[PDB]
Amino acid sequence: MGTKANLVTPRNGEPLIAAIQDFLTGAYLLTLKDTFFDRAKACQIIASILVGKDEKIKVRLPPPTILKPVTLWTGKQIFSVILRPSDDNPVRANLRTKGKQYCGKGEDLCANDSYVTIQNSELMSGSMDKGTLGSGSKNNIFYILLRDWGQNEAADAMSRLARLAPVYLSNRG
Amino acid sequence: KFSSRHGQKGVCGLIVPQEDMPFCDSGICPDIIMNPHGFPSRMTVGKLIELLAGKAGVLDGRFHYGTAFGGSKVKDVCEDLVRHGYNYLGKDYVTSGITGEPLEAYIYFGPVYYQKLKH
Amino acid sequence: VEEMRSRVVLGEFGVRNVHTTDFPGNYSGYDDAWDQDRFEKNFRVDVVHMDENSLEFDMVGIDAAIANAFRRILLAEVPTMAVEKVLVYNNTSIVQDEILAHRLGLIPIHADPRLFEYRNQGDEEGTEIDTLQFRLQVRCTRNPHAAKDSSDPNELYVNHKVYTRHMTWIPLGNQADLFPEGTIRPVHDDILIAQLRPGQEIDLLMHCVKGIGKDHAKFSPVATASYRLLPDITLLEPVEGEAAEELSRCFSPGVIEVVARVANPRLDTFSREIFRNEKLKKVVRLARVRDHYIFSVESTGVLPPDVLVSEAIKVLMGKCRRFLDELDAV
Amino acid sequence: KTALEMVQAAGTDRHCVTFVLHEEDHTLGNSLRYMIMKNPEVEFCGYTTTHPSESKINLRIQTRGTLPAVEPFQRGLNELMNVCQHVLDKFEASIKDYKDQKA
Amino acid sequence: MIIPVRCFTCGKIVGNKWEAYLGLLQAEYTEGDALDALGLKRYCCRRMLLAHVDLIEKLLNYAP
Amino acid sequence: GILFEDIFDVKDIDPEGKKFDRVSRLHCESESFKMDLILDVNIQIYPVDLGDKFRLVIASTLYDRPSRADQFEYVMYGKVYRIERLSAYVSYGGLLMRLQGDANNLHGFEVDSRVYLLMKKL
Ligand SMILES: [Zn+2]
């Protein structure tokens, strides 16, 4: 009866334990295409995820996606730190799906940007809707982290987002 | 348990210190930070006007009538915030208490009648 | 091409540039790696309007992270003296006992801290080096020359209202270092503690202790200790021909000159009325300077506000020398 | 027993430590984070309160080369103490000038 | 009950501004500019006088 | 070390309407190679306008101590993540690039490899 065992309801197979309310609207506003963090805010949002079984990892900030005119990270690159904070973490999550307000035409290249593509636990395109993080969808990441990589990595990546996404949202307002 | 005079009751989940809390420009740190997700599903737009009719009310020294089917309309409350140098919707520019940088978006702000209740 | 990492810019729907973004290897071409003498030269403090119980100095040239220390330190880490234990005797007032004992807590006390020390143990007796006792003995009757009117100052008014004038000072020990108004009860002598009707008493001793503001907010030395970045408003287009006096009533009153000139930007409250105009919102970008803010300290009256700030910096320096001596142990 | 370091691994790594500063909060963390991020040899600095119930922050410093995760921290305070020495003196020289101008 | 001697949000000393406020409303002074005469700039300290009811003069009647 | 380079002409600054305040998705065309690309560019740092010839270089590496390739004035960093006349989808965190067409000159590309942009106006 542990929560790490019953992440999944026995009617459908859907996950019931997943983000609710603010965490979803936190991580959507963070993985939205427009956000850009400098190494000021980037190491501040990331270092929120270092308490309570997580304080003993060499947290690897990914290299930034703009270099020359100003160097700054993007929002989705910091959401990848949720799925794989350390260097020696064995999680490689993979997911490709539609989203809400889907563009209809175009696979992943249209400007509406509602098409998630995660390769090796690095969010490559798209923004995290409810349908890619919440409860009820069989293609959110916490369901994908459950089936492919055990249930400890799904509960850790869900308890990482609950610590990370309010720390962004309370400073974004 | 506190309620909010619109049926949006709520257990007081956290009690932060005052210095960790998003003060606006004139110095007013809040008392009760309310979550904005209570609004778009409940559609209690009447709460969103009490933060406007209250905030114009204290600034003028007046009690704004919001009755049923009448009362003080928004098009005259909003032009009372402008006389006291406020945003005409009430969304005031705050700066965050914790990090010290200004918040990315404006924050709605004002006095609404929170009644403690017997739970 | 041009870099406003130095102005936050306020749009109509959000606040655009916000985070400090000035650390080594962020903005190419710019070396910003904490040159100490560069900070030492580009920084000044411009004091405006210091009477009693206010202060509006500037501190131009620090990041908004250290500025949010001095706001926070002022708010809840500068110590003051306030009433903590109200030894109550006969109290027949209609005001309840704790609510009286809580309302004695919020009264500020003019005896300055850093003459006294903290209360080490429980130590409910006090040691006259830690505490500061006050007495309150009010028993109201009818005055004999009262007319038949129901005017509570005239009849029933021997002491109908328990003000803070009625509090007195029981010098605990030598207490000859402090003078006659030296521990001026409550900084404000007009504070209403409770009301009475004839035949009712309030008799209570008090104990004052030195407390951090974050322990309880009655120890807070300052009413508001907020700060705000100095705005600067740039008309991108020259405005004239009755649109200037349109832009006059749009902003705060003192901010503007009438052609249109942005005469004095410091007085601007961010109403953001430009975006209602639909014509001038493309004309002028409004902005606030990042490293030029405006502090506004207004003390309750325990310590004068020019000594609150110089105490607020003094305990942040003490908070980091407390840690630098931890590394010297290890 | 306020500051205490947290070794990254049982073997011990000096390139990344986690300072736990007791009885404090953002009042220092966010002002020390800034003064230690302006060091050119820190690739990662950041702090978090473990819980609003307890009172501690967890500063984590990660350098580039072989910085012992203590030398920027002992220079984060030393740069900040030199600031608070300077900002105090520029404050008291300005109040003393403002009061005299009012006379 | 009685006037709370602080503002709840900022903590300006506002308990000593009640009978000074009632002395203003006894005169011609409008409800608005009475609080501007007492030095109440922001609205959160303004509601502590404006929205306050004074039961303590009414309870006293029923408390011999 | 260059994977791919040519001169490009940006033709639609944002094809389907401005959706973001800091990123607009360009549509460009090459010079004599005819490689269509659909590139997102942070325009707050690097503003681009209609009909502007700009260089574009894709490099696997840049070779302040090793004295980087910095003659260019806008450098991103991201990985290729799809190869579908080949398309070649590159992602820069969230900023997509769909360099297309004529697979003989696209030969340097692969999947799951780190790729720099080095743009420059003309
Ligand atoms: Zn107040």
Note whether A131 and A99 are within 8 A (CB): yes
> Are B18 and C228 a contacting pair at CB < 8 A?
no
Strand partners, C284: C235
- Asked if D touches F (at least 3 Cβ pairs < 8 angstroms), the answer reads no
- Both tokens of C9, joined, read 């810019």
CB-based burial, F87-118: b 16+ in 10 Å, e otherwise: bbbbbbbbbbbbbbbeeeebeebeeeeebbbb
DSSP structural state of residue A120? S
> Are C269 and B105 a contacting pair at CB < 8 A?
no
* Segment (H or E) for A39: helix A39-46
CA–CA distance, D40 with D18 (Å, rounded to integer) = 19
Nearest to D40 by CA among F64, F33, C182, F86: F64
- Both tokens of B46, joined, read 């009447």
CA–CA min distance D78, chain B (Å): 21
Q: Which residues contact F63 (CB under 8 A, 6 or more apart)?
A: F1, F69
> Are A125 and F96 a contacting pair at CB < 8 A?
yes
**Cα Rg of chain D, angstroms:** 17
DSSP string, B54-89: HHHHHHHT------SS-SS-HHHHHHHHGGGT--TT
After which residues do gaps appear in chain E, with C to N over 2.5 Å? none
DSSP string, chain D: --EE---SSSS--SSEEEEEEET--HHHHHHHHHHHHTSTTEEEEE--BS-SSS-EEEEEEEESSS--SSTTHHHHHHHHHHHHHHHHHHHHHHHHHHHHHT-
Note whether F28 and F12 are within 8 A (CB): no
Q: A57 and chain F: CB distance < 8 Å anywhere?
A: no
Q: Burial-class residue F58 by CB neighbours within 10 Å (0-12, 13-18, 19+).
A: buried
Cβ neighbours around D71 below 10 Å, total: 16
- Both tokens of D21, joined, read 């500063």
- Both tokens of C209, joined, read 């202790």
- Asked if F touches E (at least 3 Cβ pairs < 8 angstroms), the answer reads no
CA C297 – ligand 1 centroid, Å: 13
Note whether D65 and D41 are within 8 A (CB): yes
DSSP string, E18-49: SHHHHHHHHTT--HHHHHHHTT--SSTTTHHH
Q: Which residue from E30, E43, E50 is facing B55, i.e. has the nearest CB? A: E43
- Is B9 annotated in a binding site? The answer is yes
Q: Which residues contact E55 (CB under 8 A, 6 or more apart)?
A: E1, E2
CB-based burial, C98-113: b 16+ in 10 Å, e otherwise: eebbebbbbbbbbbbb
Note whether C310 and D92 are within 8 A (CB): yes
Q: What does each C-alpha distance from E44 to B56, B114, C11, C202 come to in angstroms? A: 12, 14, 27, 31
Alpha carbon F20 to its chain's center = 19
DSSP string, C145-211: T--SS--TTTSS-SSSEEETTSEEE---SS--SS-TTTT-SSSSTT-EEEE--TTEEEEEEEEEEEE
In chain C, positions 13-72, which contact chain D (CB-CB < 8 Å)?
A: 20, 23-25, 32-34, 36, 39-40, 43-47, 50, 57, 59, 62-63, 65-66, 68-69, 72
CA–CA distance, C207 with C84 (Å, rounded to integer) = 6
Q: How was this structure determined?
A: cryo-EM
> Are B100 and C65 a contacting pair at CB < 8 A?
yes
> Are A70 and C19 a contacting pair at CB < 8 A?
no
Cβ neighbours around C94 below 10 Å, total: 16
CA–CA min distance A167, chain C (Å): 14
CA–CA min distance A7, chain F (Å): 30
Cβ neighbours around B6 below 10 Å, total: 17
CA–CA distance, F22 with F11 (Å, rounded to integer) = 19
> Are B19 and C65 a contacting pair at CB < 8 A?
no
- Both tokens of C173, joined, read 């020990």
Q: Is B94 helix (H, G, I), strand (E, B) or coil?
A: strand
* Best of B14, B16, B20, B37 to mutate (most A CBs within 10 Å, chain A): B37
* Segment (H or E) for C324: helix C305-329
CA–CA distance, C67 with C65 (Å, rounded to integer) = 5
Q: How many residues does chain D have?
A: 103
Note whether B86 and B92 are within 8 A (CB): yes
CA–CA distance, C182 with C174 (Å, rounded to integer) = 13
Note whether F57 and F40 are within 8 A (CB): no
Domains and CATH numbers, chain A: 23-172 (1.10.274.100)
CA–CA distance, F96 with F41 (Å, rounded to integer) = 9
Q: Burial-class residue C158 by CB neighbours within 10 Å (0-12, 13-18, 19+).
A: middle
Alpha carbon C122 to its chain's center = 30
The structure was resolved to a resolution in Å of 3.5
Report angle CA F27, F74, D35 to the nearest 5 degrees. Answer: 135
Residue numbers in C near A40 (CB within 8 A): 19-21, 23, 26
CA–CA min distance A135, chain C (Å): 30
Q: Which residue from E2, E5, E63 is facing C107, i.e. has the nearest CB? A: E5
Which chains lie within 8 Å of chain E at 3 or more CB pairs, if any?
B, C
Q: Which residues contact C138 (CB under 8 A, 6 or more apart)?
A: C159, C162, C166, C196, C201, C202
User: Could you tell me which residues of E are annotated as the binding site for Zn(2+)?
Assistant: 7, 10, 44-45
Chains C & D: contacts with CB separation below 8 Å = 113
Note whether C273 and C251 are within 8 A (CB): yes
In words, the CATH class of domain C77-222 is: mainly beta
Nearest to C119 by CA among C161, C77, C153, C85: C85
- Both tokens of B9, joined, read 């009751």
Q: E1 and chain C: CB distance < 8 Å anywhere?
A: yes
Residue numbers in C near A69 (CB within 8 A): 28
Q: B82 and chain C: CB distance < 8 Å anywhere?
A: yes
Nearest to A171 by CA among B89, B39, C20: C20
In chain A, positions 19-48, which contact chain D (CB-CB < 8 Å)?
A: 39-40, 43-44, 46-48
Note whether F48 and F41 are within 8 A (CB): yes
Nearest to C294 by CA among C59, C112, C5: C59
Note whether D5 and D71 are within 8 A (CB): no
CA–CA distance, C240 with F65 (Å, rounded to integer) = 54
CA–CA distance, C226 with F64 (Å, rounded to integer) = 41
CA–CA min distance D9, chain B (Å): 31
- Both tokens of C258, joined, read 């009438």
Residue numbers in E near B28 (CB within 8 A): 9-10, 42-44
Give the strand pairing for C227-235 and A95-98.
Answer: unpaired
CA B37 – ligand 1 centroid, Å: 27
Cβ neighbours around A146 below 10 Å, total: 22
CA E44 – ligand 1 centroid, Å: 5
CA C267 – ligand 1 centroid, Å: 21
Q: Would you tell me the crossing angle of helices A152-172 and A75-83 to the nearest 10 degrees?
A: 150
Give the type of residue at B47: K
> Are B96 and A21 a contacting pair at CB < 8 A?
no
Residue numbers in C near D26 (CB within 8 A): 68, 72
Note whether C317 and D84 are within 8 A (CB): yes
Q: Which residue from E3, E7, E13 is facing C188, i.e. has the nearest CB? A: E13
DSSP structural state of residue F74? B
Domain range list for chain E: 1-64
Q: A72 and chain C: CB distance < 8 Å anywhere?
A: yes
CA–CA distance, A36 with F22 (Å, rounded to integer) = 9
Domain range list for chain F: 4-122
CA within 13 Å, CB half, F13: 14
Note whether A173 and B107 are within 8 A (CB): yes
Main-chain dihedrals φ then ψ at residue C279, nearest 5 degrees = -115, -45
Q: Which residue from B37, B96, B99 is facing A22, i.e. has the nearest CB? A: B37
- Asked if A touches F (at least 3 Cβ pairs < 8 angstroms), the answer reads yes
Report angle CA C88, C91, C93 to the nearest 5 degrees. Answer: 135
Q: Is C293 helix (H, G, I), strand (E, B) or coil?
A: strand
- Both tokens of F74, joined, read 């806008």
CA–CA min distance D26, chain B (Å): 6
CA E13 – ligand 1 centroid, Å: 9
> Are C106 and E1 a contacting pair at CB < 8 A?
no
> Are A50 and D33 a contacting pair at CB < 8 A?
no
